[PDB]
Design a protein around this nucleic acid. Structure first.
Lengths: 96, 94
DNA sequence: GCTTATCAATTTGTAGCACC
DNA sequence: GGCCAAAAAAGCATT
DNA sequence: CGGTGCTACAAATTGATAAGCAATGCTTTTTTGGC
């Protein structure tokens, strides 16, 4: 699967950057997304998708193994909303 | 934060990296992530999250506005699963 | 208006990647 | 980096 | 450049609640490319 190592490589070949910069840039990229998210801000990457934050209240849950009913504590989760352009490029994808 | 705003922020911080280079990199990486998913391959970023593909069986859909039916072929859609760190840092509710 | 996703606790096999 | 008009993408409705 | 220990991660399991979406015309936001 695609990893930072691979991404760092493409940046090295295609754009000819030091393996140092091609490495840090990748990290910064995701770190900047994480940051924006932890600060409660929405991330909208045109051509790709949006990382929106939703605040979920508490709801009934349980222990899949046994069945012990346990309440899923309220929380704020990160969701991904892919745009059409991306959705179109994947709708006919063949799982490798 | 939009794609561009992302570039600006990254460009600002780094003083030893050309802004135009940051612009190219970001754009490239994303297009890289895109092609990957369109090739049927998943993305794995330990700590951040992972992008995969979920199958959508064929169904007799509808035109929500007119009500008319519409046959829909099987397809694949993107799916993201936030990594631990990402989940923790995002969840402000302790 | 219907289909798909969300999530609990626990185990088990896998793999990203920081650190030598 | 900024202005601006046009194109592209996304957002709305409701999705 | 390369081996590898640490752990995040994937898969699974049940069931109540939440989220997402088929078509498409019009609006709004973001990107683009010349200067």
């Amino acid at each position: 699967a695609l990893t930072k190592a691979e991404m760092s490589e493409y940046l090295f070949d295609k754009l000819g950057l030091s393996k140092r910069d091609a490495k840090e840039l990748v990290e910064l990229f995701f770190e900047e997304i994480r940051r924006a998210l932890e600060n409660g801000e929405q991330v909208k990457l045109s051509g790709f998708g949006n990382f929106d934050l939703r605040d979920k209240n508490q709801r009934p849950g349980r222990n899949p193994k046994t069945g012990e009913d346990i309440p899923i504590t309220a929380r704020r989760v990160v969701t991904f909303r892919p745009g059409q352009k991306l959705k179109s490029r994947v709708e006919n994808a063949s799982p490798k | 934060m939009t794609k561009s705003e992302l570039i600006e922020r990254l460009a600002t911080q780094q003083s030893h990296i050309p802004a135009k280079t940051v612009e190219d990199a970001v754009k490239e990486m994303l297009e890289h992530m895109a092609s990957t998913l369109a090739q049927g391959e998943r993305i794995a970023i330990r700590g951040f999250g992972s992008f995969s593909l979920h199958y959508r069986a064929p169904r007799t859909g509808r035109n929500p506005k007119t009500g008319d039916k519409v046959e829909l072929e099987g397809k694949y859609v993107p799916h993201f699963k936030p990594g631990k760190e990402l989940r923790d840092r995002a969840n402000i509710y302790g």
